[PDB]
Amino acid sequence: RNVMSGTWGELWLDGNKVAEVKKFQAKMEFTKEDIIIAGQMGTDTKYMGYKGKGSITLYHVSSRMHKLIGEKIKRGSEPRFVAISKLNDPDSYGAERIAVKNIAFDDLTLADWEVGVKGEIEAPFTFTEYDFLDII
Template sequence: MALDETRAISGTFGEVWREGNQMTQASEMQAKVKVHKADIKVSGDRWIGKKVVALEGTGSLKGFKVTSEMLQMHDPVAKNEKGYVKTELISKLDDPEAYGCERIRLKNVIFDEIPLVGWKVGEIVEEEWPFTFKGYELLDPIVES
């Protein structure tokens, strides 16, 4: 069966949701899970086996500076009350020509950096928020129909 090119998903229809609200300023998001393995050497075997010992979730969220929402969310950090803010993010990819919508929930998201100032005369201000997460859930998978 040949690929139907019209079904290739465009990032144009990507959305990010936090605390039930769409983050309309988001322009790019990525998240991945790194699998950490330990070598297992067995007597009488030249092959080195692998054992999964840990999982690590990392990602980043990029977007246009429209409001101070993200900075205000981290206000307790500035006041040294908690040291971090934990939240959940939902990525939604819903190209109308695709086989369906994909939604993935990232759990226990903690942002790694808090950008305070970053602008240049004549340029649109964009921000990047790198983060780590612990756990995810595929809410809506895309399946060929």
């Protein structure tokens, strides 16, 4: 048994395999409120909800991100996407799959380059709900 390496990472965006990818990340922050109870020095907290955040980093092989949202954003209609991430390490015990749904992107990078540096593009995003597949 070994810790699963990040090399064996695959990502499907809207049913299309994203061949070029460097990092993937999805996370969930809970919102807590401080509540003080009479007679207790300890300060307990109440759970009020959660917010989802994440980002993707990929090499600038193609103008993939433009075709999805560039035309729609200027018109005023926001598209929502679904992403699936699978991590399958041959050394590890098994493979897990995550279905992250209702994804909205925070920014669009039209062009970025520098002399002597390979193109690299990253795009943060937010999501609402998730579904879980192939537990380990």
